[PDB]
């Protein structure tokens, strides 16, 4: 039951993977970091989970799909599937955690859905503000002529989010923890604490910040990745014997929306001013006049949706 074929040559996918202080071919305790839209690996995790996971005993690794995750999401997924295949064997055929933010969570779940070979190679998934259903703040699909391919695909009602949904991709495939906020200014809707939210996965550990820390708790898109509450939740997921964050680990002791306590003062300042969410506004990306066609492995699950070739059919 082979994997679908990569549209990209494997050497191009290998050029996006980097382990801090080790080689991806031979590494002990790796963790895969998948960045958000408009960012590279370092731009997303420089001030937070690259130094934080290193203190927890992991070798930080990450992918940086070019250019800044603005290309087709299904191509960004190839970088991740190649990265886990590499890191899993690189640690001697041992599962590894994967930690994501924004489109990274949608990339992680796309790869787990359509590339079965990696499903038993990810130990657990820890996703901060993932947009599995996309976002409504991306505008209507009929006013994005020229916008980046991934911006088309993360627009609510896209063929990509439709196919992921109908393929069974809104169910956790490996042990997953999703930490998100109702006050996410990038990903909406996030207010229901229910399967209506873009970050919700069926059977996962879905942690909406306001459900733990109260409705008046305010935490933005970037804060969802760097807050002390995010660190304590993220650390519970990684150390858990269930592979999901445990409600007994974190609690209301931890409801602090500022950069993680174990960060340095320099790394706390950089995390409190992280503009990566809005970095894309200045970066030049690809041009796209219609939603990118779905790869043949996902086309059946979005029948009736409109992409560049026309209305998808069986
Ligand atoms: Ni983002």
Residue numbers in the entry: 4 to 317
Text taken from the publication that reported this structure:
Surprisingly, Cys105 in variant QW4 appeared to be oxidized to the respective sulfinic acid. When purification and crystallization were performed in a glove box, Cys105 in the crystal structure was in the normal (reduced) state. Interestingly, the nucleophile exchange (S105C) in QW4 results in a conformational change of helix 277–288, compared with QW10 or WT. While the helixes of QW10 and WT CALB are well superimposable, the helix section P280-Y282 of QW4 is deformed and shifted toward the active site, with an additional H-bond between Y281 and E188 formed. The interactions with Y281 and E188 in QW4 further positions the substrate in the catalytic pocket of the enzyme. In striking contrast, the potential energy surface scan for QW4 disclosed that the acylation reaction follows a two-step mechanism involving a HisH+/CysS− ion pair, in which the proton is first transferred from the thiol group of C105 to H224, and then the negatively charged thiolate anion acts as a nucleophile, attacking the carbon of ester bond of the substrate to yield the tetrahedral intermediate. However, optimization of the point which is closest to a transition state corresponding to the concerted mechanism always led to the Cys105−/His224+ zwitterioinic pair, indicating the concerted mechanism is not preferred for variant QW4. The high catalytic efficiency of QW4 is attributed to its optimal binding properties, as well as the relatively low reaction barrier in the rate-determining step.
Lipases function according to the classical Ser-His-Asp catalytic triad mechanism. We succeed in evolving cysteine-CALB mutants that are even more active than WT CALB.
